Design a protein around this ligand. Sequence first.
Ligand code: HEM
Ligand SMILES: CSc1cccc(C(=O)O)c1
Ligand SMILES: [Cl-]
Length: 393
Amino acid sequence: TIPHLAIDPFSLDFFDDPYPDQQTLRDAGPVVYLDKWNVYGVARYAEVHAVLNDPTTFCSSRGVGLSDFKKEKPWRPPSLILEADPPAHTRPRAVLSKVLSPATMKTIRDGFAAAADAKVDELLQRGCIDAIADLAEAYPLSVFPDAMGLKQEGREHLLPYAGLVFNAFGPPNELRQTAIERSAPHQAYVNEQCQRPNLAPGGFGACIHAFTDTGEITPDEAPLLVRSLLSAGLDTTVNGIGAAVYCLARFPGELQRLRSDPTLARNAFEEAVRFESPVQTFFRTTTREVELGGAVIGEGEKVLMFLGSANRDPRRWSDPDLYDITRKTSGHVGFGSGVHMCVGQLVARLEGEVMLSALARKVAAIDIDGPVKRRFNNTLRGLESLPVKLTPA
Ligand code: HEM
Ligand SMILES: CSc1cccc(C(=O)O)c1
Ligand SMILES: [Cl-]
């Protein structure tokens, strides 16, 4: 009853252009079987949203990558939040929620916005820039390591470590095995910056450690929660901001609307998150036999959720392949959905909003003026290089 497909969603041809294969996955049925990796797949909005919102049946503690932690040993100690289920997940989640809270956003907003304006002013002096290295990477690098409380030395480890983490959710293909081969120095640096004495006062990392006396987490759980923010909080925003700039470069009519009302900045970034879905895929593991969209799935089976595909499902979205900065984006799954929904989404949205605000106020045109090169990752979608000329307003 379940269609079997040979599509490899972790192949370079897939990453290069996922959208035809994603339609094939959606239209084959609500539940498909991917023979290449022996996993179930769900690519429509309805099933993806259903799976995300039943964490009991579709658990995360057996891993949210291809690997099943009941069968193989995790490549690194499990995340206490991403790779945990309720109730063990609940109190670490609460702590990160309060650390990455509206009050914390109020403390950092003015500084995040100054750096966004400063960066755009600096790029406008160069004219022709790489919107990845010089913007999508440079701007988060200028705010997020400092907001964490990290020392200056060794920050060049951060993006390689995150790329490794996201590649490691994938199958044991060359992307994943090469990433792990090169992992030793990046893991060393990261695990070391997770210790309380190495995190500057007032930052996110020192705040997690300062939350270790409330009965929610113990001191030995704080380094791994810092590790969560160093894994999940930089590379995602790089690809989210890169997606937004790529969208404005490809849809000049939407840049013109954004310029005329810079208060659309926050929704323009949210739409970019839906439209490109920087985090493309995640797995769950079934804890029991379950019926999903007419399909019987046995216990202990991996289920691949196509988040990017669900965000382009025409069953849920009108004109899903159009970038529309006034779209009602509520309900997109680019940040997930349910008990694991991105606990850092306020940081991501703050960064994306203030950057698109700076572009809206200072830039008249964004024109691609060089070869676009895609960056390949088993989990993240984004560009390696995006050459653009910025015309000042
Ligand atoms: C555009 C940027 C971002 C995107 C697209 C994104 C995406 C996601 C997604 C899809 C999930 C759900 C994972 C799952 O359901 O298994 C998630 C969870 C999470 N995100 Fe984000 N994220 C972004 C930015 C950030 C930032 C800035 C931080 C930290 C400062 C962060 C930290 C986390 C953490 C710790 C989790 C685990 C939450 C949990 O399991 O309860 N993310 N993110
Ligand atoms: C998409 S959320 C995420 C991604 C990578 C790592 C972690 C973590 O908690 O270590 C979380
Ligand atoms: Cl690690």
